[PDB]
RNA sequence: ACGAGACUCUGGCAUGCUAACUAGUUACGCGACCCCGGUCGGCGUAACUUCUUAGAGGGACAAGUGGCGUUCAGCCACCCGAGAUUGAGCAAUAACAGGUCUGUGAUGCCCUUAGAUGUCCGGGGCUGCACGCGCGCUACACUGACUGGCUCAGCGUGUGCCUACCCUACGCCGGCAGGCGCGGGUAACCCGUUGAACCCCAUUCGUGAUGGGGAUCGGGGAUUGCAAUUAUUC
């Protein structure tokens, strides 16, 4: 890519990506329940799914 | 040839073992004859797997000692090689026959231990291990801070020990054990 | 004509020796240099084991080459020994009878159990809290 | 050859120091201050001499020649960096300071830092370490 | 404690007891002659190459860290 | 803390759990910090099965 | 008739060092009498004719694996830097003394600049390498 | 006191202040009739001949 | 030491009291019958059990077991 | 024409179910396929003290993120590769296609 | 019911299997040298997967035999075999007023909050030395040191979102530390066949605080940075 970082620096930077989700959401979406997410990778489209108990909130 | 095996150039036959008690743990004859005293190993995995290890191998293994020398089996192979080539030019006989008589005339028969120490006999394997011990620690001292090289001091040890001249370190430290054990029993 | 080649291997601590049997005359050399010109010369008769336990006439019609990398000095020496001693026993198993393969195996059995079976000893890993695999750093009271 | 030669010189008298002829030539000269083991092998190279001899067999005439090279290494194209005192503080002469001058140029610069009240020289005046050592745990023989 | 004042270059009394005495020895090594002639080891190495070239002793083991010589043919 | 510890204990039991463990540490009923710990049923501690059989919060 | 890899290496380099004496057009530099071989060395080598020894030792290295540069040459001539009180470390060789060797071997044709970097020996320089190697076997046959 | 050679018939067990000795039952090779107990040092196998500098020193059994 | 624990013994007895007629005498054959009559997660446990089954056979040919 | 694909993942079985999935969609189309070359898997090595302070016996951690990678080479142009790689993929698998 | 075991990784074992122009091997085609034959990390191809890598399964279970034991659990030996105990992570109940509030946007309470215990800058200190203790490194030499020569590795790491800074080949200049130039490497691809020491081979020294030992200290020269004076390292 543009900076073309190695896979070591690519996996762990996207491993830090997961860890910052599972802290950002537990500090906001905790009053409505939170049970982790599942990030899904596609080209030019990155869909994440917030698995939580109270979807109507 | 696959018939006769030489220690490089030293013969392996015609070395009779004088002790019937000690001939069990001296691997030098007709099956344990190797060109070099440097085998791969596989001798410290059973209790008596040390027994069929060749006695010439045990001598080099009993030499790398005191720090710096530990782990250097090549140079003690060269040491014992140079040491052997001295004995045939100093006694005129085969070096192995000297080494056989070196072990036999240095091993303490009795040894005292805590049970007021009861003197008790030794096993022949312990008598071998102490024999290769004493005529190695005596050559390390006679070579230390001395112009006389270790390949020379090793020769002088087992030459004096093979006749029991009561001047070799292995001989003096052996008679003391057999004296103190004779004392308290 | 047809190629009677066998590529027999042999390992040690890390030193791996892959030999290469062939039909022809008898030449025995590793990496381009013969076994009478291999350092350390303190161990020359280890490289001469399968030619003195079997005789120079066994490798008469067989020419062998060995490529070796890795390991250390002594480890390479034992690597070359259980490559060409295993090379002749596998060459004498595919192209001739095993009455001539067992008659060379049993001599290599009774002399040393390393020319045929590798040594499985590998260097033990280091754990924290010490300098080596088993040794620990010095403990200080008071 | 193998025996003692004639007019042997058992001890040499160089820069009012002793040089025993028993020791080899490349290593006997090192008894002089300001010349070590490395600088000895090159003065015996700018002066052609087989350094396998001892310092008590070599002839008297050519040991005078190596003395010329000691206090004057410049004209024998000995390099500038190889010296011990390069770019002198006063007059900037690249020379090799030998024995009596070495312990003369030593107590010439110690007080030069003391007169100017330099922190470097003050430690020499105080008998302490100067190169930035930790004196918490060492220096216990000459420091009572 | 004790100082072994060795000699650096031979004398005509030592050089006399080296050409008729050293080849008489059964074992010849530069360490066994440095202690029966009171000389250094350098003058023990350097004093056996010519006795090798003159053919008064024979070499039996030449090595970097160790060298030993012997008498000539008894016959 | 007692009746709420049960309130989530028996709630997962009907859910279909094999057996669980709730621990509540901290200063309760006074200054010195005790540590209430009410377990039930079947639960393992050691070994590689713990990576997927239990989840900790 | 044989090549160099069937010849003892110890009795080859000084067989080749004297071969770099019977020609005598190597143009040895001026500091050869006063230079230290490496920072891990503390003395100049005893042999006065050392510039002829390593020019031969480098030559057989370019026979075995060519394409070696100066950075490759300061690595083979590396040693254990005994650092006094601190534990020893691997120290590379000197660059200029490694460079003046091959800069002399490109002068009288033995070695040339390899494609994309290196220093491989010339065809006619390989010729005498087999030649001197044969007479070593003649010294032992 | 003439020297005697005596060959093991059975190893009894370990003894000593710290388990450094092996109590070993031995029979004499010069006469298989007479046999005695004798505490030995070092590792002892079965049937290897021992060199007892005295014979009338029987060892006590535990 | 090599002493069989209960979960390799209680699971090897129930095998005999359910499939005595399928297994045989030697280790290797009833090693592969055990993979079929029971679901065992690992392979070490496969050999631990099937080895104990043959040790129990050599106790059955000499009479009953408790 | 000579199109490479570089597979990578942290988990092994998630890749081995989708690496073979390429050929099971490739041999369906009956085109020339190169076998996935198992290149040496790296391992992210991180070691830290267990204790957040400096008290107690010195204990450490051995953290690993061993990372696998496979390479399938094809003999198909840039239009047919968009139908095979687009299907049946796992989240923790990262798929990269090189045109040259 | 837990813990132990089992379990997971790791260590070697499978000329069988899955496949490699980022890995190799053997042939072949020339090329270079030497005497059909030999060497060649010198040069391109069609087969192969032993060597490399890593996938799937396989193999070991006290399975066999000989003694011992209630002849039960099992022990011991031996044959056969790559192993007839590889190493490690994981790790119970209850507790310690063990350590950490200097790991935190974990935090009660108290204190402080404008002349600040906040923040920021400048400079110093964290190294300071009659002395005591702990973990270590080099040593005390000849089984050595020195100088040449020869010859073998495996773990990794490598151009950073902010962040301005990567690992290094080759070619010149320089005694060296280093410098100037142009390249490759986001990596089985370039470093790199990681020419690592020890060791080995051959010189020299010869028992002398010695060429053992390199503390201490003087002079000089380069690199890092805004800055090295209390010596940044070299």
Cα nearest neighbour of D36 on chain G = G43
- The rounded distance, in Å, linking the Cα atoms of C48 and D3 is 48
Element (H, E) at J5: strand J4-9
From CA C72, how far away is CA I6, in angstroms rounded? 48
Residues 6 or more apart whose CB falls under 8 angstroms from that of G78 comprise G38, G40, G90, G91, G92, G93
**Cα distance between residue B36 and residue A32, in whole Å:** 80
Reference B181, options B126, B109, B119, B130; nearest CA is B119
Any chains having at least 3 CB pairs less than 8 A from chain F are: none
CA dist., res. B124 & res. B122, Å (int): 6
Among the listed residues D26, D70, D47, D98, the one whose alpha carbon sits nearest the alpha carbon of residue G33: D47
Q: Which nucleotide is nearest to C75 (CA to C1')?
A: K152
Q: What is the largest CA-CA distance in chain A?
A: 41
**Distance (Å, rounded) from C-alpha J93 to C-alpha J90?**
5
Q: What sign does the dihedral F21-F26-F30-F35 (CA atoms) show? A: positive
Residue whose C-alpha is closest to residue A34's, from A23, A15, A50: A50
| Angle, CA of G95, G101 and G103, to the nearest 5° | 95
Compute the CA torsion angle B170, B173, B174, B177 (nearest 10 deg).
Answer: -160
With contact defined as beta carbons under 8 Å apart, do B138 and B165 qualify? no
Any C CB within 8 A of J63 CB = no
Residues of G in contact with D40 (CB under 8 A): none
Q: Evaluate whether B97 touches B26 at the Cβ level (below 8 Å).
A: no
- The residues pairing with G120 across neighbouring beta strands, listed in sequence order, are G112
Q: Which pair of tokens denotes residue J12?
A: 């092994």
Task: Determine if residue C5 is left, alpha or beta; phi over 0 gives left, psi from -120 to 50 gives alpha, anything else beta.
Answer: beta
Give the number of other Cβ atoms within 10 Å of residue C5's Cβ.
11
- Smallest Cα distance from G47 to chain C, Å: 24
CA distances from B104 to B37, B160, B178, C45, I54 (A): 20, 13, 14, 30, 53
Residue in D61, D81, D70 with CA at minimum distance from that of residue D42: D70
**Dihedral (CA of F14, F16, F18, F22) sign:** negative
* DSSP sequence for H3-41: -EEEEEEEEEEEESSSS-EEEEEEEESS-SS-EEEEEEE
Residue showing tokens 């009288």: G108
The three-class DSSP label of residue I51 is: helix
Closest CA to D39 of D27, D49, D50: D27
Taking the CA of residue B155 and the nearest CA in chain E, the distance in Å comes to: 12
Cα radius of gyration (chain H)? 11
Taking the C-alpha atoms of residue D43 and residue D60, their distance in angstroms, rounded to an integer, is 16
Q: What distance in Å separates the CA atoms of residue D36 and residue D17, rounded to the nearest whole number?
A: 15
DSSP D56: T
Residue showing tokens 């054959």: I29
Flag if B114 and H45 touch (Cβ within 8 Å). Answer: no
Per the CB < 8 A criterion, the answer to whether E27 and E66 are in contact is: no
> What are the residues facing H4 on neighbouring strands?
H52
d(CA B57, CA D23): 42
Residue C90's closest CA among C6, C1, C4? C6
Nearby residues of G133 by Cβ (< 8 Å), 6 or more positions away:
G2, G3, G4, G6, G7, G12
Residue D81 CB coordination number (10 Å): 7
Q: Which residues of C touch G5 (CB under 8 A)?
A: 31-33
- Nearest nt to the B66 alpha carbon by C1': K143
Q: What is the spatial distance between Cα I55 and Cα I62, in angstroms, rounded to a whole number?
A: 12
Resolution (A): 3.1
Roughly how many angstroms between the first and final C-alpha of chain H, as a whole number?
28
Do the Cβ atoms of D46 and G33 come within 8 Å? yes
Contacts of H26 (CB under 8 A, 6+ apart): H6, H7, H8, H9, H35, H36, H37, H38, H50, H52
Q: Looking at beta carbons, which residues of chain D come within 8 Å of G44?
A: 38, 41-42, 45
Nearest-5° angle of CA C95, CA C101, CA C107? 155
Cα(J72)–Cα(J4) distance, integer angstroms: 6
Cβ count within 10 A of residue G95: 12
- Separation between Cα atoms, residue I54 and residue I4, nearest integer Å: 13
Q: Which chains touch C (3 or more CB pairs under 8 A)?
A: B, G, J
User: How far is it, in rounded angstroms, from Cα J94 to Cα B106?
Assistant: 73
| Chain H contact present for B26, CB below 8 A | no
The two structure tokens encoding residue F50: 């713990």
Q: Are B75 and B83 in contact (CB under 8 A)?
A: no
Closest CA to H44 of H5, H17, H14, H3: H14
CA of B68, C1' of K145: distance in angstroms? 14
Distance CA B146, CA E38 (A): 14
- On whether the CB atoms of residues B34 and B6 are closer than 8 A, the answer is no
CA E55 to chain centre: 13
CB contact under 8 A, H44 and B118: no
Q: Are H21 and H40 in contact (CB under 8 A)?
A: yes
- What is the distance between the alpha carbons of residues B32 and G128, in angstroms, rounded to a whole number? 49
CB B26 within 8 A of CB B17: yes
- What are the C-alpha distances in Å from B63 to residues B56, B135, B143, C73, E66? 11, 10, 12, 21, 17
- The first and second tokens of residue D126, run together, are 């105080």
Among candidate residues C117, C115, C119, C118, the one with its CA nearest the CA of residue C53: C115
The H-or-E segment that residue C82 falls in is helix C73-94
Cis peptide before C40 (omega within 30 of 0): yes
Count of other CB atoms within 10 angstroms of residue F45: 7
Give dist(CA D44, CA I1) in Å, integer. Answer: 75
Nearest nucleotide to F31 by CA–C1' distance?
K108
Distance J93 CA to K17 C1' (A): 26
* DSSP letter for each residue of F3-48: HHHHHHHHHHHHHT-S--EEEEES--SSSS--EEEEE-S----SST
Q: Is J58 exposed, middle or buried (0-12, 13-18, 19+ CB in 10 A)?
A: exposed
Bridge partners, residue H35, by sequence? H27
Nucleotide nearest to F27 (CA to C1'): K108
What are G100's two structure tokens?
A: 């003046």
Contact B48 H5 (CB under 8 A): no
- D74 CB neighbour count, 10 Å cutoff: 15
Smallest CA-to-CA distance from H40 within B115, G100, C69, B90 is with B115
Give the number of C-alpha atoms closer than 13 A to the C-alpha of residue G96, restricted to the C-beta side. Answer: 10
Q: Please give the helix or strand (H or E) that residue F53 lies within, else none.
A: helix F50-53
Q: Please give the Cα distance from H22 to H13 (Å, whole number).
A: 5
Q: What is d(CA F11, CA C58) in angstroms, rounded to the nearest whole number?
A: 81
B partners (3+ CB pairs within 8 A) are C, E, H
Breaks in chain E, named by the residue before each, with C–N above 2.5 Å? none
Binding-site residues on chain G for chain C (CB distance < 8 A) = 5-8
Phi and psi angles of residue E33, each rounded to the nearest 5 degrees, phi first: -95, -20
> Is residue G43 within 8 angstroms of chain D, CB to CB?
yes
Alpha helices by DSSP H, listed for B51-166, are 55-61, 73-87, 95-104, 124-143, 150-163
Q: Is H44 within 8 Å of B125 when comparing Cβ atoms?
A: yes
Q: Phi, psi (5° rounding) for residue J94?
A: -115, 120
Burial readout C54-88 (b: 16 or more C-beta within 10 A, e: otherwise): beeebbeebbbbbebeebeebbbbbbbbbbbbbbb
Q: Which pair of structure tokens corresponds to residue G61?
A: 């290295």
Q: Which of C40, C46, C53 lies at the smallest CB-CB distance from B2?
A: C53
**Residue H15: beta bridge partners?**
H21
| Residues G64, G121: Cα–Cα separation, whole Å | 10
The answer to whether residues G59 and G16 touch, using CB atoms and an 8 Å cutoff, is yes
Asked if H35 and H26 count as a contact pair (C-beta separation under 8 A), the reply is yes
Q: Give the single-character DSSP code of D104.
A: H
Rg (Cα) of chain J, in Å, rounded? 19
d(CA B86, CA B93): 10
DSSP conformation class of D118: -
- What is the distance, to the nearest Å, from the Cα of residue C123 to the centroid of all Cα atoms in its chain? 19
Contact A38 J91 (CB under 8 A): yes
Q: How far, in Å, is the CA of E51 from the C1' of nucleotide K180? A: 59
A38 vs J contacts (CB less than 8 Å): 91
* Calpha distance D13→D56 (Å, rounded): 12
> How many Å apart are CA B112 and CA B126, to the nearest integer?
13
Place of tokens 């009240």: D117
Give me the residue spans of the domains in chain B: 1-185
Cα–Cα distance, J26 to G44 (Å, whole number): 68
Of F14, F13, F9, which is closest to residue F24 (Cα–Cα)? F9
Return the structure tokens found at C56.
């120079």
**Beta bridge pairs of residue D13:** D18
Q: Which nucleotide is nearest to B69 (CA to C1')?
A: K143
For residue G58, which of G95, G96, G102, G93 has the smallest C-alpha distance?
G102
> Burial, J78: exposed, middle or buried (Cβ in 10 Å; 0-12, 13-18, 19+)?
exposed
Nearest to E36 by CA among E67, E51, E14, E16: E14
Residues of chain G neighbouring D78 (CB-CB closer than 8 A): 34
H runs (alpha helix) in chain D: 25-28, 37-46, 60-71, 99-115, 119-125
Cα–Cα dist J86/J89, whole Å:
7
CATH 3.30.360.10 assigned to domain E1-75? The reply is no
Longest dimension (CA), chain E: 47
Cβ neighbour number for residue H42 with a 10 Å cutoff: 19
Q: How far is the C-alpha of C125 from the C-alpha of D37, rounded, in Å? A: 45
Q: What is the largest CA-CA distance in chain G?
A: 52
Distance CA B45, CA B62 (A): 18
J25 CA to K192 C1', in Å? 39
Inter-residue contact C52 to C43 (CB < 8 Å): no
The torsion region of residue B168 among left (phi > 0), alpha (psi -120 to 50) and beta comes to beta
* Distance in angstroms (rounded) separating the CA atoms of residues J9 and J94: 6
CB D35 within 8 A of CB D98: yes
Distance CA G41, CA G81 (A): 7
H20 Cβ neighbours under 8 A, 6+ residues apart: B113, B114, H41
Choose among D40, D41, D77, D26: nearest CA to G30: D77
Residue among C133, C139, C110 nearest C121 (CA): C133
> What 8-state DSSP symbol labels residue B137?
H
Residues B72 and B48 sit within 8 Å (Cβ to Cβ): no
SS3 F57: coil
J58 close contact with C: CB closer than 8 A:
yes
- Do strands C28-30 and C64-69 pair parallel, antiparallel, or not at all (unpaired)? parallel
| Cα–Cα distance, B136 to B61 (Å, whole number) | 10
Check: CB of residue D35 under 8 Å from CB of residue D29: yes
Of H10, H3, H2, the residue nearest H37 (C-alpha): H10
- The minimum CA-CA distance between C130 and chain J, rounded to whole Å, is 10
Q: List protein-proximal bases of chain K (any atom < 7 A from a CB).
A: 1-8, 10-13, 15, 18-20, 22, 25-27, 32-35, 37-42, 50-56, 58-64, 72-76, 82-83, 86-95, 97-100, 103, 127-139, 141-161, 168-178, 186-188, 191-193, 195-211, 213-221, 229-232, 234
DSSP H stretches of helix in D13-86: 25-28, 37-46, 60-71
The SS3 call for residue A51 is coil
Helix/strand/coil for G25: coil
Q: Which of B126, B160, B125, B153 is nearest to B137 (CA)?
A: B153
Give the separation between CA G16 and CA G10, rounded to whole angstroms: 10
Q: How far apart are CA D38 and CA D25, in angstroms?
A: 13
The shortest CB-CB distance from C42 to any of B31, B42, B74 is to B74
Name the residue among J4, J3, J6, J21 with its Cα closest to residue J96: J6
Partners of B182 on chain H (C-beta within 8 Å) are 53
- Least Cα distance to H43 among H26, H27, H19 occurs for H19
d(CA B153, CA E26): 16
- The angle at the Cα of E31, spanning E28 to E34, to the nearest 5 degrees, equals 100
Q: What angle do CA B76, B78, B82 make, to 5 degrees?
A: 115
Tokens of C17: 């020796």
Look up tokens 């030098």; give the residue. Answer: B28
Q: What residues of chain D lie within 8 A of the CB of G51, using their CB?
A: none
Q: Which helix (H) or strand (E) holds B33?
A: none
Q: Which of D37, D46, D79 sits opposite G43 (nearest CB)?
A: D37
DSSP label at residue C7: -
CB atoms within 10 A of CB G18: 14
The closest alpha carbon to G72, from G50, G52, G101, belongs to G101
Cis peptide before G42 (omega within 30 of 0): no
DSSP assignment string, C31-80:
TTEETTS-S-TTS-TTTTHHHHSS-TTTTTTB-EEEEEESS-HHHHHHHH
Distance C14 CA to K18 C1' (A): 26
């Amino acid at each position: 890519m543009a900076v073309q970082i190695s896979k070591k620096r690519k996996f762990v930077a996207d491993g830090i990506f997961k860890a910052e989700l599972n802290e950002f959401l537990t500090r906001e979406l905790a009053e409505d329940g939170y049970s982790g997410v599942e990030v899904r990778v596609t080209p030019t489209r990155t869909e994440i799914i917030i698995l939580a108990t109270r979807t109507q909130n | 040839t696959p018939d006769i095996k030489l220690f490089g150039k030293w013969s392996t036959d015609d070395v009779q073992i004088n002790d019937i008690s000690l001939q069990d743990y001296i691997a030098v004859k007709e099956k344990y004859a190797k060109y070099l005293p440097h085998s791969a190993g596989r001798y410290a995995a059973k209790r008596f797997r040390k027994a069929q290890c060749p006695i010439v191998e045990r001598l080099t293994n009993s030499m790398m000692m005191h720090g710096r020398n530990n782990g250097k089996k090549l140079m003690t192979v060269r040491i014992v090689k140079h040491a052997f080539e001295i004995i045939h030019l100093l006694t005129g006989e085969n070096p192995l026959q000297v080494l056989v008589n070196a072990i036999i005339n240095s091993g303490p028969r009795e040894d005292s231990t805590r049970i007021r120490r009861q003197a008790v006999d030794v096993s022949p394997l312990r008598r071998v291990n102490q024999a290769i011990w004493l005529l190695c620690t005596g050559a390390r001292e006679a070579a230390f801070r001395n112009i006389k090289t270790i390949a020379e001091c090793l020769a002088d040890e087992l030459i004096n020990a093979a006749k029991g001249s009561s001047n070799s370190y292995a001989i003096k430290k052996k008679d003391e054990l057999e004296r103190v054990a004779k004392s308290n029993r | 004509g047809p190629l009677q080649s066998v590529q027999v291997f042999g390992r040690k601590k890390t030193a791996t020796a892959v030999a290469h049997c062939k039909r022809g005359n008898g030449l025995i050399k590793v990496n381009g240099r013969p076994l009478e010109m291999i350092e350390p010369r303190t161990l020359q008769y280890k490289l001469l084991e399968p030619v003195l336990l079997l005789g120079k006439e066994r490798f008469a019609g067989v020419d062998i080459r060995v490529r070796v990398k890795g390991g250390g000095h002594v480890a390479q020496i034992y690597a070359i020994r259980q490559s060409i001693s295993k090379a002749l026993v596998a060459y004498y198993q595919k192209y001739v009878d095993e009455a001539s393969k067992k008659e060379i195996k049993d001599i290599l059995i009774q002399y040393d159990r390393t020319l045929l079976v590798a040594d499985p000893r590998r260097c033990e890993s280091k754990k924290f809290g010490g300098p080596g695999a088993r040794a620990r750093y010095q403990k200080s009271y008071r | 050859s193998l025996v003692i030669p004639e007019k042997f010189q058992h001890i040499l008298r160089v820069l009012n120091t002793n040089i025993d002829g028993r020791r080899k030539i490349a290593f006997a000269i090192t008894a002089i201050k300001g010349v070590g083991r490395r600088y000895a092998h090159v003065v015996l190279r700018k002066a052609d001499i087989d350094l396998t001899k001892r310092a008590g067999e070599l002839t008297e005439d050519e040991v005078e020649r190596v003395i010329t090279i000691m206090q004057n290494p410049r004209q024998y194209k000995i390099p500038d960096w190889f010296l011990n005192r390069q770019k002198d503080v006063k007059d900037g002469k690249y020379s090799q300071v030998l024995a009596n001058g070495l312990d003369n140029k030593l107590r010439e610069d110690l007080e030069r830092l003391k007169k100017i009240r330099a922190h470097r020289g003050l430690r020499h005046f105080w008998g302490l370490r100067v190169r930035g050592q930790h004196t918490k745990t060492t220096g216990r023989r000459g420091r009572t | 404690r004790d100082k072994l004042n060795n000699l650096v270059l031979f004398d005509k009394a030592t050089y006399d007891k080296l050409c008729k005495e050293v080849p008489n020895y059964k074992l010849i090594t530069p360490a066994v002659v440095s202690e029966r002639l009171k000389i250094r080891g350098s003058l023990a190495r350097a004093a056996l190459q010519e006795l090798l070239s003159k053919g008064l002793i024979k070499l039996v083991s030449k090595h970097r860290a160790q060298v030993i010589y012997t008498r000539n043919t008894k016959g | 803390v007692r009746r709420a510890c049960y309130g989530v204990l028996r709630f997962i039991m009907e859910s279909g759990a094999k057996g669980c463990e709730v621990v509540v540490s901290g200063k309760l009923r006074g200054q010195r910090a005790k540590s209430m710990k009410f377990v039930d049923g079947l639960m393992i501690h050691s070994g590689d099965p713990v990576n997927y059989y239990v989840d900790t919060a | 008739g044989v090549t160099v890899k069937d010849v003892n290496q110890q009795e080859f380099v000084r067989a080749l060092a004297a071969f770099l004496k019977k020609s005598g057009k190597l143009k040895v530099p001026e500091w050869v009498d006063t230079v230290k071989l490496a920072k891990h060395k503390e003395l100049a080598p005893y042999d006065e004719n050392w510039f002829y020894t390593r020019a031969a030792s480098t030559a057989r290295h370019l026979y075995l694996r060519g394409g070696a540069g100066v950075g490759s040459m300061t690595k083979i001539y590396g040693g254990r830097q005994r650092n006094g009180v601190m534990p020893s470390h691997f120290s590379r060789g000197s660059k200029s003394v490694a460079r003046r060797v091959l800069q002399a071997l490109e002068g009288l044709k033995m070695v040339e600049k390899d494609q994309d970097g290196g220093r491989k020996l010339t065809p006619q320089g390989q010729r005498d390498l087999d030649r001197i190697a044969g007479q070593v076997a003649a010294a032992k046959k | 006191q003439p020297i005697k050679l005596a060959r093991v018939t059975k190893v009894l067990g370990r003894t000593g202040s710290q388990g450094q000795c092996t109590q070993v039952r031995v029979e004499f090779m010069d006469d298989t009739s007479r046999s005695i107990i004798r505490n030995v040092k070092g590792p002892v196998r079965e049937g290897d001949v021992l060199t007892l500098l005295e014979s009338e020193r029987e060892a006590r059994r535990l | 030491g090599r002493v069989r624990t209960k979960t390799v013994k209680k699971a090897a007895r129930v095998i005999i009291e359910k499939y005595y007629t399928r297994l045989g005498n030697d280790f290797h054959t009833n090693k592969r019958v055990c993979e079929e009559i029971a679901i065992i997660p690992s392979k070490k446990l496969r050999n631990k059990i099937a080895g104990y089954v043959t040790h129990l056979m050599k106790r059955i040919q000499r009479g009953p077991v408790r | 024409h000579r199109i490479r694909i570089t597979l990578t993942s942290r988990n092994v079985k998630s890749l081995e179910k989708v690496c073979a999935d390429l050929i099971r969609g490739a041999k369906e189309k009956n085109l020339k396929v190169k076998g996935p070359v198992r290149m040496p898997t790296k391992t992210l090595r991180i070691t830290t003290r267990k204790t957040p302070c400096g008290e107690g016996s010195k204990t450490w951690d051995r953290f690993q993120m061993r990372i696998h990678k496979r390479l399938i080479d094809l003999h198909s142009p840039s239009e047919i590769v968009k139908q095979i790689t687009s299907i049946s993929i796992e989240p923790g698998v990262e798929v990269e296609v090189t045109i040259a």
